Amino acid sequence: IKIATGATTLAFRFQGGIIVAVDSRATAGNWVASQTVKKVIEINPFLLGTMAGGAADCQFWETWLGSQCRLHELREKERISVAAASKILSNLVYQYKGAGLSMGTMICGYTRKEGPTIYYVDSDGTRLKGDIFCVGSGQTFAYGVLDSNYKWDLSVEDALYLGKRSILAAAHRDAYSGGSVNLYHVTEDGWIYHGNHDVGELFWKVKEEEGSFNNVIG
Amino acid sequence: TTIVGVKFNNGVVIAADTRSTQGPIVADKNCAKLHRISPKIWCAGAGTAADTEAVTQLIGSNIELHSLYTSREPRVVSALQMLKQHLFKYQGHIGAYLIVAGVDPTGSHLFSIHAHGSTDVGYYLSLGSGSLAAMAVLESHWKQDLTKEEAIKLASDAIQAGIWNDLGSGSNVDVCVMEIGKDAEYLRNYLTPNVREEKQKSYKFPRGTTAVLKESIVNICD
Amino acid sequence: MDIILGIRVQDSVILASSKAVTRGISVLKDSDDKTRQLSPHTLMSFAGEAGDTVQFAEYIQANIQLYSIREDYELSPQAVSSFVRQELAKSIRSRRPYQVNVLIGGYDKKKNKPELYQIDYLGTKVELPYGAHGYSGFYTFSLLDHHYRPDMTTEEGLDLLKLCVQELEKRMPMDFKGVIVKIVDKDGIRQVDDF
Amino acid sequence: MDIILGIRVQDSVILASSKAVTRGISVLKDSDDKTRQLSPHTLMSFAGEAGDTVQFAEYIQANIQLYSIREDYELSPQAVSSFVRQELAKSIRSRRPYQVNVLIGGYDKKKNKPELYQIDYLGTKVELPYGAHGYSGFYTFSLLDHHYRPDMTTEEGLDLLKLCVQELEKRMPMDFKGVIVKIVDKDGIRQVDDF
Amino acid sequence: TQQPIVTGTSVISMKYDNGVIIAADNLGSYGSLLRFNGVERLIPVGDNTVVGISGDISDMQHIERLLKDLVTENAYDNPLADAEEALEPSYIFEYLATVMYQRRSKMNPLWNAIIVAGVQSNGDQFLRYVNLLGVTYSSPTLATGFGAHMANPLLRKVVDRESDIPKTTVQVAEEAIVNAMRVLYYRDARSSRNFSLAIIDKNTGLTFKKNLQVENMKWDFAKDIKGYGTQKI
Amino acid sequence: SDPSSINGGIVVAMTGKDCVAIACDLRLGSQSLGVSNKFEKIFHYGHVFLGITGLATDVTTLNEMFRYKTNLYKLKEERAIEPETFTQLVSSSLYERRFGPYFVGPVVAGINSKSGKPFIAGFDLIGCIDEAKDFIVSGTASDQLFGMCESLYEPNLEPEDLFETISQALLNAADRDALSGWGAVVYIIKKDEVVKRYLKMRQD
Amino acid sequence: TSIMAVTFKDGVILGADSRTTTGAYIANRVTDKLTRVHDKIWCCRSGSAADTQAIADIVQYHLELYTSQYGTPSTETAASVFKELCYENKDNLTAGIIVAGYDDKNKGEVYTIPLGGSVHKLPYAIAGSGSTFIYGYCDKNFRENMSKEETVDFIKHSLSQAIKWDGSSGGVIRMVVLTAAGVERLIFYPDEYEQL
Amino acid sequence: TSIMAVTFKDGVILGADSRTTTGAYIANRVTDKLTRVHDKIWCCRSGSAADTQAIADIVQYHLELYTSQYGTPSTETAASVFKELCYENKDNLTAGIIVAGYDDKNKGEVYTIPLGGSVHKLPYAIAGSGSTFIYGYCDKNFRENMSKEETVDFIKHSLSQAIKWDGSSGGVIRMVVLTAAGVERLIFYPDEYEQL
Amino acid sequence: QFNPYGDNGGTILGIAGEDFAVLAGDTRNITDYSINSRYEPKVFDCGDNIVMSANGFAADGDALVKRFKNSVKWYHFDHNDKKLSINSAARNIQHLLYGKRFFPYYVHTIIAGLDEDGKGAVYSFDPVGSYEREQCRAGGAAASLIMPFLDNQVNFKNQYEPGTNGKVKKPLKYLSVEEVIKLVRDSFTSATERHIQVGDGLEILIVTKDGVRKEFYELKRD
Ligand SMILES: *[C@@](C)(CO)[C@](*)(O)[C@H](CC(C)C)NC(=O)[C@H](Cc1ccccc1)NC(=O)[C@H](CC(C)C)NC(=O)[C@H](CCc1ccccc1)NC(=O)CN1CCOCC1
Ligand SMILES: *[C@@](C)(CO)[C@](*)(O)[C@H](CC(C)C)NC(=O)[C@H](Cc1ccccc1)NC(=O)[C@H](CC(C)C)NC(=O)[C@H](CCc1ccccc1)NC(=O)CN1CCOCC1
Ligand SMILES: *[C@@](C)(CO)[C@](*)(O)[C@H](CC(C)C)NC(=O)[C@H](Cc1ccccc1)NC(=O)[C@H](CC(C)C)NC(=O)[C@H](CCc1ccccc1)NC(=O)CN1CCOCC1
Ligand SMILES: [Cl-]
Ligand SMILES: [Cl-]
Ligand SMILES: [Mg+2]
Ligand SMILES: [Mg+2]
Ligand SMILES: [Mg+2]
Ligand SMILES: [Mg+2]
């Protein structure tokens, strides 16, 4: 079978919380299986997870994670920390290490004691706290736009555009990334969905309005 | 592919299906696998498509030059000998599996050639992925002293067995009849039992459906 | 194995090439010039298999210089790029192919236009506004795709390039010890000493 | 992968560990702390296979902290190092071994002496005046062999270390994004913020 | 993980208007050696089912033992064991198919290809295939091994689809099967002349024919064949 | 390391009423990395058109080779080469490299100047000719193109209608292939006029 | 394949089955494995059908050219030409050939040429995959200076058993008789030899 | 190995060579391959010496325990125990065994058990590497209801040929006769059987 | 070495309408170049207005369907005959597939039915349990041939409003059951022409609030 598919996912911390942005394409070799894949997993109203590597592995275990988080707050009468939620997942995949799980995800949340927090969790056991993360076949293209334009004091509007523009950059260059862009804004009171954006229409729109992509005739 | 050859009273007949594959994909639904080596010597080809066409054209060319040099009509055994020695030299790397048949001053003949250069003689033969399906029919219905019309029927029935039961074979049935004292008659699309049914809907688009960025006149003249 | 970049702007072509030469776990040199002048208005940068790179670049250089003497005339960048492509196209089906990727930056004096050609070791030629070889493109193209304008000046091109090198220095795993930058324009070839 | 160094001087142990975390062709982080405090006067740095490193370090940390609570007493660096060695010695013959190399820097309060232990993933323990894991030793040991004196101060030790990091930054192929330095002495563990 | 040692070749079968026919040769091959000649590969279960098996003979003998034990077990505490609660072909097939798939899922297969032919209690014809992979399918004609390549084409000329079954008599169907067994003897290098044939009819019941031989063969034309091309003598 | 799917690309050709059409995408990449969106895969020698997919270096090399051979043909024959003859030349040239082949999928298209008959043909990498009445496909999205063409195509289409059919066949096939797209070009070929149109498509 | 050649009082007889296989499929059930390289020098072919045909064709060419210059070649000479081809191209050939011929001086002679390309002159020879099963039978039943009818029965019974046990052998039993009288072709069908 | 078992009028006779090899070295030239699992149920062993010994020892244990509880076991029962071991451990065994026994009701019986672990009841059986060379001879010469002396000659001549052609067979020919009279051991030396 | 997997060919297709949903599949079963059956159904009514097909390796496909049908049965026992919603069935199937993550069912699964608002629903699964709801999905051997055609005709991709300079897209709308069946039939007749593993017959299962209806159509048998 083929679990090794392409993607571009990102998540970054800023003044107003966390932005999460992903592409929508799934490929089996050169064959484009889907253009409408949901690569952001809604763990619960306060926590998000990104899909990269194995689609099933990410779906199954990040849904499972939501079940563990619900049990935590039922027993402790308190919201689970992002640190604790991420570690439940990382410890779990570490047990399966060597078996062949394929996972590269960002666990994103905003709590009182922590603030906006992102943990990169990975199928070989890695668990990293950080400000900016990009994962997938098109991660390099997205990093370039992120690094050069990122500031902590970004507005919510500008931060949403930056995440959208970074995915577009990858979708354009990386063959295994594209379809559409899904945006999310994570606040202390929960995440907010900021729509699905077709890359076909989005590209031409950004080209005209921004003046970028002069190499492309339109 | 499915290809066959059948001897009869006053000559020989060969036949073939018309499917050409590229993996599991049908590349050509109506390709010609019957090749002319000389006017009265014809060849059915299975295996690597380029190799069967290339090897049959090369030997056909050399047969023509030989016929002109000797002031004689070419013989099937000459084509057989030239083909097998060519194929043997390339140790099977030229993937041509052929049924060679024809009439000449010596009489009527039917042979098969394999990629590695081995030849066989027979009254009925079959090659290709559907050869087992075809051979099953030939072994069931063949007899000595076949007429022209009986041999065509048997040959086409053998190809049909391949068409229906072998996924490698399909579409139509080509035939070539080589009778002694007569011109060889090539019967292209002798049977067409796989006609595509009428489509449910027309997919003719309204004009202007396709978005266009630039138009320009191309200069083909000098 | 390294960083060769190229940017074609309004009136010039800019080539940037990494200075590091690594063998095993040791950086043997940090001031290596990965380029050869083929003609007064044509420059070629290169990257790939050790030994093959310089051997190929100098072989091309010799052939172009021979042509210049014979005809008392400079070949156009397009003509040079086609010659280079054909040599690599021959090479790929040889007993031992040249594993060399090149960028050819030149200024066409007849057209009064800068030209940048990207040719990989297979003999795959493309004319581009900006180009790269290896992993370098994976980082910089999104930046160039965004910030690059066709009417930029040489100074604007150098700033755009700095931005690319900064992104490479931030996100690339290996230390490539900075870059040597060279400009090709109507007045010929010159090196930027402070980068 | 990478750079963990250790130097034992007169009155303290200094550990230096690289900040880079690389996965594929991308530096994911440049501020990673590759160490855990096992006890108030014992520090362990680590390097090796991804995931295994942190999982192992935290497992050891938990066991030593458990001991401290149970006995209301701090284990000596020698005792901690022996415990760590045994865990790795068990691990190497397991179904899936911990591929982790560690340095253990500690100050023994009973002896009033600093102690540095080097333990590889096989469970190979050695007490040393200075130590390293991976390719780091191939560069720095000749420097330490030369400049290291047993009666050095903490400040002299930090200068000797700077010299090592400089040689690594010059000759090593990969960019390891500098080092986090920590000192272990009679007063406990503290971090040098400006290095 | 196995490799087959002593093997049995093609099993062929088809439906006709009132029942089913199944046949298989009596050979147990040991690679290229035609070692055993008295091997029965058709095994009746009750008076309404016949299981035809190809592939590894040691695994076939194991399946024989399972089917024999199945009949015994079904008779336990069952007053209607020879009537309403007798073993059906569909019951026997599903049991085998369960076993074959379980064994492939433990990476220790029964190296066989099996065809279960019979008539149900309501008169319906039953014909289904199962193999070492647990793969199952049904068709008006079914065959294993070389039979799939050579017999099916001949049997499908008689019964090409479902509507051809009522139009096919037992005389015509048996003739086609016997003809197919001759063709396999001509063209399969691991086949024998001797074979067994079984008919399960909804009216006349189970008829089991042993020690049949391929006959009416065409070999005379061989004398006229000389050399491999040019040779005249 | 599969030469035919490193650079990516597609070509499709169709026949209509007294006309032919040939179309190609503009992408050139290095596996996942898109490198150029101006890499045209269709060339012409006189009134004969040749599309080539596969390994880009061989695409370039073969174009230069057939330009070479058709220029000499014209000088000696004192006339432009016809599609049927050119098809045989392509086949011969490819089979000459039978045991060290060019990794390509060429497609010939054109109208015979004498008879006026529309002609298309396709080849495999070693020169086997695939002649067709209806359509020919080639490239990394050949499966997708076969599916579109087999459903969308109908005989005797007028040039303006044929344009829409071939354009839609190419566009929708290219969007289900990662290694194809990034622009497209369509040639509409009549007896004595040729129109070339660039299509607007999604750039991902 | 099952092939054999047997010398007797009046000359020599070659024998063979008629089966040609591709794996377990019988590509030809009426094959002629007894092939003429000269008027009264024949050979039995086993191994690769392509290799043995190519070899026999070359030998026939060499012996035809020999005859034009030096007159009728000996059976030993024919075996030497076979050997030369089989030995010098041993790395690229799979051919087990038995050479049999009739001289007036030397009478019936049999030479066998295995895979390696060695030559062995024998009273009788057996070869091919099916020969393994009749080494015991042939050794016990062979006698020198047999009659024509005895030799025909010996070959018939021997190849009958070889065919019975070997899946790679079958069809008809072809035979070629080489004597001073001339060349006689014989054939025996399944219905006869199977029930021996 | 060359082994065989043959039923006849008065019972059954087992036969075997005495060679044990390690590659081309003969580790034992006087091996006893005919082994007792019960008073009048014996077996011929071929394949791995270790595997066949381990199997025979287990079968002897099972049949001894059977006899203590249920009385004398049948030859079919003995063959079933062999089969069970050979079939269930087919992945780890290399054993070709022929089981032979004498009942008063059933008389002489022979069962053969090849590599796979299948069971085949036969009038006579041959097995081992050397058996290949005598399939033809044994098929032509075997008759049902032979006398003791005829059966001894049949086995002697058969194994003589198997030994002659098979390098992996040789030494002495051991035989064990199973009848109502009792159990008789026979041996035949090279000087006798070679010149048959 | 023993290979526990096989390829039984075939292709399937699921489309969702406004108040209905269809799940189609060809009836041909194959191994290599042989036809095992011309009519072997692989689209099943599983109860609770859920239709299901698991295409690829038929042994794994039958096992999965059999386990899901059983899952539906026990859902009724354990939860007071509650109707299993299509979304609940989908999640349950994920757990069936992922339960064998390290020895997968070699199948592409598609289910169809109506959601809890009465609207048409189609869900598709990869071999290890990742799933997604879609309007349109083709699976199996000829998926690559059919799917881009659906994108164009169902979701109107690459189609712009005539005269609008490619600025205004063609508007999305629900299709009738009659129009959907037309697309299904044309999809399969096209795939039959160009894919060797597709043919013989076409069986469609239509799901409305009234129940599950069946339709059968002949396909080319070559
Ligand atoms: C029946 C239909 C199948 O056995 C017949 O035997 C026919 C015989 C007729 C056409 C003469 N055989 C084929 O159609 C034959 C099957 C085949 C395929 C591959 C190897 C051997 C036999 N098909 C072909 O030869 C096609 C002809 C095309 C459709 C015009 N050619 C290919 O499939 C080539 C194979 C070329 C080849 C090179 C070296 C050694 C052997 C064969 N393959 C491709 O084009 C695949 N690929 C496409 C992307 O570009 C790179 C190559
Ligand atoms: C008996 C059968 C064995 O001793 C005889 O020796 C006869 C001799 C007669 C024909 C003169 N031998 C064969 O029939 C011979 C068996 C054989 C096979 C392979 C190598 C050596 C001997 N059969 C052949 O030579 C056939 C004849 C064809 C069907 C007309 N050829 C093949 O089987 C080719 C040979 C390729 C080859 C392999 C190794 C060395 C030389 C040539 N093989 C295939 O076609 C492979 N086949 C493809 C389909 O997949 C199954 C394998
Ligand atoms: C004839 C010889 C063949 O049919 C008989 O079957 C006899 C049967 C008698 C002894 C009951 N078989 C043997 O003599 C038998 C031949 C054999 C060899 C290997 C596998 C199967 C059969 N010989 C043996 O079993 C010897 C007996 C020793 C010398 C006492 N054992 C070996 O040859 C061992 C066996 C190891 C083994 C391999 C595979 C499966 C099971 C066991 N092999 C070696 O010692 C290897 N030897 C080491 C030195 O380098 C050369 C190889
Ligand atoms: Cl032959
Ligand atoms: Cl022993
Ligand atoms: Mg893309
Ligand atoms: Mg695309
Ligand atoms: Mg036989
Ligand atoms: Mg079809």
Short mmCIF file of N, CA and C in Angstrom, two decimals, chain E residues 127-188:
data_model
loop_
_atom_site.label_atom_id
_atom_site.label_comp_id
_atom_site.label_asym_id
_atom_site.label_seq_id
_atom_site.Cartn_x
_atom_site.Cartn_y
_atom_site.Cartn_z
N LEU E 127 -22.15 -24.19 -7.16
CA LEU E 127 -20.81 -24.32 -7.71
C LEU E 127 -19.97 -23.12 -7.31
N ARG E 128 -18.98 -23.34 -6.45
CA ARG E 128 -18.14 -22.25 -5.98
C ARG E 128 -16.69 -22.70 -5.76
N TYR E 129 -15.78 -21.74 -5.89
CA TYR E 129 -14.34 -21.98 -5.86
C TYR E 129 -13.74 -21.29 -4.64
N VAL E 130 -12.69 -21.89 -4.09
CA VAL E 130 -11.89 -21.25 -3.04
C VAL E 130 -10.46 -21.78 -3.12
N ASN E 131 -9.49 -20.93 -2.80
CA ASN E 131 -8.08 -21.31 -2.89
C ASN E 131 -7.28 -20.96 -1.63
N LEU E 132 -5.97 -21.22 -1.69
CA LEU E 132 -5.04 -20.96 -0.58
C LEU E 132 -5.10 -19.54 -0.02
N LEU E 133 -5.48 -18.57 -0.85
CA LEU E 133 -5.58 -17.17 -0.42
C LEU E 133 -6.90 -16.84 0.28
N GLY E 134 -7.86 -17.76 0.22
CA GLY E 134 -9.20 -17.52 0.75
C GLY E 134 -10.09 -16.80 -0.25
N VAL E 135 -9.61 -16.67 -1.49
CA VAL E 135 -10.36 -16.02 -2.56
C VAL E 135 -11.50 -16.93 -3.00
N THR E 136 -12.69 -16.37 -3.13
CA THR E 136 -13.87 -17.13 -3.54
C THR E 136 -14.59 -16.47 -4.71
N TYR E 137 -15.10 -17.30 -5.62
CA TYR E 137 -15.95 -16.84 -6.70
C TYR E 137 -16.78 -17.97 -7.26
N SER E 138 -17.89 -17.60 -7.90
CA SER E 138 -18.81 -18.56 -8.50
C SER E 138 -19.06 -18.19 -9.96
N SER E 139 -19.34 -19.21 -10.77
CA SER E 139 -19.54 -19.03 -12.20
C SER E 139 -20.22 -20.28 -12.75
N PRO E 140 -20.92 -20.17 -13.90
CA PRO E 140 -21.50 -21.36 -14.53
C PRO E 140 -20.48 -22.45 -14.85
N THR E 141 -19.25 -22.04 -15.17
CA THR E 141 -18.13 -22.96 -15.30
C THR E 141 -17.01 -22.51 -14.37
N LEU E 142 -16.34 -23.48 -13.75
CA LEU E 142 -15.18 -23.20 -12.90
C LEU E 142 -14.10 -24.23 -13.16
N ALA E 143 -12.85 -23.79 -13.11
CA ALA E 143 -11.72 -24.68 -13.29
C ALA E 143 -10.48 -24.14 -12.57
N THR E 144 -9.58 -25.05 -12.20
CA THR E 144 -8.34 -24.69 -11.51
C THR E 144 -7.13 -24.98 -12.39
N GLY E 145 -6.03 -24.28 -12.13
CA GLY E 145 -4.76 -24.52 -12.80
C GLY E 145 -4.82 -24.30 -14.30
N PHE E 146 -4.32 -25.28 -15.06
CA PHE E 146 -4.39 -25.23 -16.53
C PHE E 146 -5.82 -25.24 -17.04
N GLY E 147 -6.70 -25.93 -16.31
CA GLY E 147 -8.12 -25.96 -16.64
C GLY E 147 -8.73 -24.58 -16.81
N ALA E 148 -8.27 -23.63 -16.00
CA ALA E 148 -8.74 -22.25 -16.10
C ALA E 148 -8.40 -21.64 -17.46
N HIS E 149 -7.24 -22.00 -18.00
CA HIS E 149 -6.75 -21.44 -19.26
C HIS E 149 -7.29 -22.17 -20.49
N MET E 150 -7.51 -23.47 -20.38
CA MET E 150 -7.90 -24.30 -21.53
C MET E 150 -9.32 -24.86 -21.48
N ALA E 151 -9.78 -25.25 -20.29
CA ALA E 151 -11.10 -25.86 -20.16
C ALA E 151 -12.22 -24.82 -20.17
N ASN E 152 -12.08 -23.78 -19.35
CA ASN E 152 -13.11 -22.73 -19.26
C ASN E 152 -13.55 -22.18 -20.62
N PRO E 153 -12.59 -21.86 -21.52
CA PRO E 153 -12.97 -21.44 -22.87
C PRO E 153 -13.87 -22.42 -23.63
N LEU E 154 -13.63 -23.72 -23.46
CA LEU E 154 -14.46 -24.74 -24.11
C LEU E 154 -15.81 -24.89 -23.44
N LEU E 155 -15.82 -24.85 -22.11
CA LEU E 155 -17.06 -25.00 -21.35
C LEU E 155 -17.95 -23.76 -21.45
N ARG E 156 -17.34 -22.60 -21.64
CA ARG E 156 -18.08 -21.35 -21.81
C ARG E 156 -18.74 -21.22 -23.18
N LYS E 157 -18.30 -22.03 -24.15
CA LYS E 157 -18.97 -22.10 -25.45
C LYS E 157 -20.33 -22.79 -25.34
N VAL E 158 -20.48 -23.63 -24.32
CA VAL E 158 -21.74 -24.32 -24.03
C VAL E 158 -22.62 -23.44 -23.15
N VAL E 159 -22.07 -23.04 -22.00
CA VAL E 159 -22.78 -22.18 -21.04
C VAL E 159 -22.02 -20.87 -20.85
N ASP E 160 -22.35 -19.89 -21.69
CA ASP E 160 -21.67 -18.60 -21.71
C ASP E 160 -22.24 -17.63 -20.67
N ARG E 161 -23.50 -17.83 -20.28
CA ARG E 161 -24.13 -17.03 -19.23
C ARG E 161 -25.20 -17.83 -18.48
N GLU E 162 -25.87 -17.18 -17.52
CA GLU E 162 -26.86 -17.83 -16.66
C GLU E 162 -28.03 -18.43 -17.45
N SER E 163 -28.50 -17.71 -18.46
CA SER E 163 -29.65 -18.14 -19.27
C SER E 163 -29.39 -19.39 -20.11
N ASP E 164 -28.12 -19.76 -20.28
CA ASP E 164 -27.76 -20.97 -21.04
C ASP E 164 -27.84 -22.26 -20.21
N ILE E 165 -28.04 -22.14 -18.90
CA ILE E 165 -28.05 -23.31 -18.01
C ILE E 165 -29.27 -24.21 -18.20
N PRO E 166 -30.49 -23.63 -18.26
CA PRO E 166 -31.67 -24.47 -18.54
C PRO E 166 -31.66 -25.13 -19.92
N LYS E 167 -30.91 -24.54 -20.86
CA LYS E 167 -30.83 -25.05 -22.23
C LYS E 167 -29.78 -26.16 -22.40
N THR E 168 -28.99 -26.40 -21.35
CA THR E 168 -27.91 -27.38 -21.40
C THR E 168 -28.30 -28.67 -20.70
N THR E 169 -28.26 -29.78 -21.43
CA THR E 169 -28.59 -31.09 -20.87
C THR E 169 -27.36 -31.75 -20.25
N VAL E 170 -27.59 -32.82 -19.50
CA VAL E 170 -26.52 -33.58 -18.86
C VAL E 170 -25.65 -34.33 -19.88
N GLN E 171 -26.24 -34.71 -21.01
CA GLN E 171 -25.51 -35.40 -22.07
C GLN E 171 -24.51 -34.45 -22.72
N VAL E 172 -24.99 -33.25 -23.05
CA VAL E 172 -24.16 -32.22 -23.67
C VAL E 172 -23.06 -31.74 -22.71
N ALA E 173 -23.43 -31.52 -21.45
CA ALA E 173 -22.48 -31.03 -20.45
C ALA E 173 -21.37 -32.04 -20.16
N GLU E 174 -21.73 -33.31 -20.04
CA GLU E 174 -20.75 -34.37 -19.80
C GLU E 174 -19.79 -34.51 -20.98
N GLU E 175 -20.32 -34.37 -22.19
CA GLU E 175 -19.52 -34.45 -23.41
C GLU E 175 -18.44 -33.36 -23.44
N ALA E 176 -18.82 -32.16 -23.02
CA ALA E 176 -17.90 -31.01 -22.99
C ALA E 176 -16.79 -31.21 -21.95
N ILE E 177 -17.16 -31.73 -20.79
CA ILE E 177 -16.20 -32.02 -19.72
C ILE E 177 -15.18 -33.07 -20.18
N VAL E 178 -15.67 -34.15 -20.78
CA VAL E 178 -14.81 -35.24 -21.25
C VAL E 178 -13.86 -34.75 -22.35
N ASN E 179 -14.37 -33.90 -23.22
CA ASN E 179 -13.56 -33.27 -24.27
C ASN E 179 -12.47 -32.38 -23.67
N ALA E 180 -12.83 -31.62 -22.63
CA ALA E 180 -11.88 -30.75 -21.95
C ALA E 180 -10.74 -31.55 -21.30
N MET E 181 -11.07 -32.70 -20.72
CA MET E 181 -10.06 -33.56 -20.10
C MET E 181 -9.08 -34.13 -21.12
N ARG E 182 -9.55 -34.35 -22.35
CA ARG E 182 -8.67 -34.79 -23.44
C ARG E 182 -7.70 -33.69 -23.84
N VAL E 183 -8.21 -32.47 -23.95
CA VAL E 183 -7.40 -31.31 -24.32
C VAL E 183 -6.31 -31.06 -23.27
N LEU E 184 -6.67 -31.23 -22.00
CA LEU E 184 -5.69 -31.09 -20.92
C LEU E 184 -4.62 -32.18 -21.00
N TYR E 185 -5.00 -33.38 -21.41
CA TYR E 185 -4.03 -34.47 -21.58
C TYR E 185 -3.08 -34.19 -22.74
N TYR E 186 -3.58 -33.53 -23.78
CA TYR E 186 -2.74 -33.11 -24.90
C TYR E 186 -1.69 -32.09 -24.47
N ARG E 187 -2.10 -31.15 -23.62
CA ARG E 187 -1.37 -29.90 -23.44
C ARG E 187 -0.84 -29.58 -22.03
N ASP E 188 -1.24 -30.36 -21.02
CA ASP E 188 -0.74 -30.18 -19.65
C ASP E 188 0.30 -31.26 -19.35
#
